[PDB]
C-alpha cells in the first residue's frame, strides 16, 4: 500500500545522519509500515463511525 512506500523512505534518509550509505537488511521493513497504513485507514472508518456517534451521543445526552 502507500504506507509500505512510506516505510521505505522513512528507513532511508534514516542513518543518513550516520551517513550510513543506501539501505541494509533491517531497512526493508516496508511490510510492517504497509500494515500501519491499513490500520490507520481502518481506525478512521471506526473513528468516523464513532465521530458520527459522538455528535448523536451528544444530542441524545443533550435531551
Amino acid at each position: 500500500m502507500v504506507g509500505a512506500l512510506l516505510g521505505l523512505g522513512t528507513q532511508m534518509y534514516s542513518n543518513a545522519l550516520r551517513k550510513l550509505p543506501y539501505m541494509r537488511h533491517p531497512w526493508e521493513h516496508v511490510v510492517g509500515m504497509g500494515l500501519g497504513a491499513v490500520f490507520a485507514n481502518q481506525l478512521v472508518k471506526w473513528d468516523v463511525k464513532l465521530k458520527e456517534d459522538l455528535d448523536v451521543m451528544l444530542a441524545k445526552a443533550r435531551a
Binding site: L6, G9, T10, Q11, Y13, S14, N15, A16, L17, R18, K19, L20, A40, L43, V44, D47, V48, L50, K51, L54, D55, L58
Partner: protein, 481 residues
C-alpha cells in the same frame, strides 16, 4: 477492576526498581550500569501499558466505585492517555543514546520516568480535586528528581531547585484553590463540583467561595505548563538542564497538564472568567515567544521559547469556547509534540557539539546536508509555513478562532508566526546561505533518534496529502468531554 493499565505500570516500576537495586548492588555483577538495561525494558513497560490501556478502552469504565469516588476514565482520556504513553516512549527513544554516553548508573532515573507516566496516566483520568492534585504531585515529584540527576554538576541541581520551588508553589497554589472550592461545594469530586458550578457565572449568579478557589486552581495549572503569566524561572529550567532531560519535561508533563486543564475547567466550571484568562495568556505567550526567539541566542533556550510560543497557540483553543476550537487545540498539541520530539532529536543529533550558538550549528549544508534540510523542516513547523503540518494545525486553530470570533487573538498569532518566520529564514540562511562559522563536522546518532526524525519529518511533510485522520481523531476527543 478498571485500574489494571495503571496497576501494570506501577507494578512494572516496582519490578524494575527491585531489579535495578538488587542488580546494581551486586558484587557478582560488579555493580553494573543498569540504566539502558532498565531502558529498553523501560520503553516496553510503557508499550505494554499502552496496549493494556488501549485493549481495555471499552472495559475501562468497569465500576461506579472507581469513577464516583476515585478516578473516571472516558473516551477523551483514553485517546490522550494513548498519546501520553507514545509521547513518553518517543522521548525515551531519543534519551537512550544520552544514557549510553553519560556514566548513567541511575537505574532509578528510568523508574522515575515510568512513575511519572503512572502519575500522568492517573492525572488524565483523575476526576476528583484530591485525585488530580495527588496525581499532579507524583508526576511533578518524579520530574523534580530527574532535573537534579547530575549531582556532581551544580547547574542541573540549581535548575532543579528553581523547578522544585516553582513545582511546589504550583501544586500548593492549586491545593489552596481546592480548599476554597471544597468549602463552597461540600464535595471534592469534579462530577459533584460540576452540578454545583454548572452555569455559575460569577456575574449572573453569586459564587464568592467557589471563585476564590477557582482563581487559585487556575493559577497553579499555568505555572505547570510554563504559561507566560507564571513562566517565572521555567525557561531557565529548560536551558540549564542537559537537552534529553529537558525534552522529557518539555512535552509529557505539558501534554498531561493541558489534557487535565480541559477536563478540570470546561466540564466543572462554567463562568465567563476561565476562557478570558487563557485568551490573555495566549496573546502574551506568543508575544513573549516571538520577542524571545529573536532575543534568545542559545539553540536550547530558543527551542524552549518557540515551545512557549506554540503553547500560546494551544491555549487559544480553550480560550474560544467552541468544541471545534478545543479540537483545534488537540491538533496543535499533537503537531507541537511531534515537532518538539523532532526538534530535540535534531539538537540531540549534534551530541558531539558541547553547548554552542546557532552560528556554530550552521555549516551543516556541506556536512550532513540531509540533516540540514531536516533542521529546516523543524523550524518551519513551529514557524507556520503552509506546507508543514504545524501550519495546518495553526490554520485550524485560526479558522476556529475566526469562527469563535477571536479576530484580535487570531491576528497576534499570525503576527507572532510572522515574527517567528523572519528568524527562521535567518536561521535557514544561517544553516546554508551565510555564517557557516568554521565548517564544523558533526557525529552520528542511534537509529531510534534518526527514525524519530524520519517518522516525524516525513509525516510533517506528508500531512498535506492525507490530513483527514488527525482532524477526525482530535474532534472526537473534544466532543467526549
Amino acid at each position: 477492576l478498571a485500574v489494571f493499565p495503571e496497576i501494570f505500570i506501577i507494578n512494572a516500576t516496582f519490578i524494575l526498581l527491585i531489579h535495578g537495586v538488587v542488580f546494581s548492588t551486586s558484587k557478582k555483577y560488579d555493580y553494573p550500569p543498569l540504566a539502558s538495561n532498565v531502558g529498553w525494558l523501560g520503553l516496553l513497560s510503557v508499550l505494554i501499558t499502552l496496549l493494556l490501556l488501549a485493549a481495555g478502552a471499552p472495559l475501562l469504565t468497569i465500576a461506579h466505585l472507581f469513577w464516583n469516588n476515585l478516578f473516571r476514565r472516558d473516551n477523551f482520556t483514553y485517546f490522550c492517555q494513548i498519546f501520553l504513553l507514545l509521547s513518553t516512549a518517543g522521548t525515551i527513544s531519543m534519551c537512550f543514546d544520552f544514557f549510553d554516553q553519560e556514566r548513567f548508573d541511575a537505574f532509578e532515573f528510568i523508574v522515575l520516568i515510568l512513575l511519572s507516566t503512572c502519575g500522568m496516566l492517573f492525572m488524565i483520568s483523575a476526576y476528583d480535586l484530591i485525585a488530580m492534585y495527588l496525581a499532579i504531585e507524583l508526576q511533578s515529584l518524579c520530574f523534580y528528581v530527574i532535573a537534579a540527576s547530575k549531582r556532581k554538576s551544580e547547574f542541573s541541581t540549581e535548575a532543579g531547585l528553581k523547578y522544585l520551588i516553582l513545582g511546589a508553589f504550583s501544586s500548593g497554589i492549586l491545593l489552596f484553590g481546592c480548599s476554597m472550592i471544597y468549602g463552597s461545594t461540600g464535595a471534592t469530586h469534579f462530577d459533584q463540583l460540576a452540578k454545583i458550578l454548572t452555569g455559575y457565572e460569577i456575574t449572573g449568579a453569586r459564587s464568592s467561595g467557589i471563585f476564590m478557589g477557582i482563581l487559585f486552581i487556575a493559577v497553579g495549572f499555568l505555572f505547570k505548563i510554563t504559561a507566560v503569566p507564571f513562566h517565572m524561572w521555567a525557561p531557565d529550567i529548560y536551558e540549564g538542564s542537559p537537552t534529553p532531560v529537558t525534552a522529557f519535561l518539555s512535552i509529557a508533563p505539558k501534554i498531561s497538564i493541558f489534557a487535565n486543564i480541559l477536563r478540570v475547567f470546561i466540564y466543572g466550571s462554567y463562568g465567563a472568567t476561565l476562557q478570558q484568562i487563557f485568551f490573555f495568556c495566549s496573546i502574551a505567550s506568543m508575544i513573549l515567544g516571538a520577542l524571545a526567539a529573536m532575543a534568545q541566542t542559545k539553540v536550547k533556550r530558543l527551542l524552549a521559547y518557540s515551545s512557549i510560543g506554540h503553547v500560546g497557540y494551544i491555549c487559544i483553543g480553550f480560550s474560544c469556547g467552541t468544541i471545534e476550537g478545543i479540537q483545534s487545540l488537540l491538533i496543535g498539541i499533537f503537531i507541537y509534540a511531534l515537532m518538539t520530539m523532532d526538534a530535540f532529536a535534531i539538537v540531540l543529533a549534534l551530541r558531539q557539539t558541547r553547548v554552542k550558538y546557532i552560528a556554530d550549528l550552521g555549516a551543516l549544508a556541506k556536512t550532513n546536508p540531509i540533516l540540514a534540510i531536516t533542521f529546516s523542516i523543524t523550524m518551519f513547523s513551529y514557524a507556520g509555513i503552509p506546507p508543514l503540518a504545524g501550519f495546518c494545525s495553526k490554520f485550524y486553530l485560526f479558522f476556529a478562532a475566526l469562527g469563535c470570533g477571536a479576530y484580535f487573538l487570531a491576528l497576534v498569532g499570525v503576527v507572532t508566526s510572522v515574527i517567528g518566520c523572519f528568524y527562521y529564514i535567518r536561521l535557514v540562511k544561517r544553516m546554508f546561505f551565510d555564517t557557516p562559522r568554521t565548517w564544523i563536522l558533526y557525529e552520528p546518532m542511534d537509529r531510534n533518534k534518526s527514525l524519530l526524525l524520519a517518522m516525524t519529518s516525513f509525516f510533517i511533510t506528508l500531512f498535506l496529502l492525507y490530513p483527514s485522520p488527525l482532524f477526525s481523531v482530535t474532534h472526537q476527543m473534544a466532543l467526549s468531554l
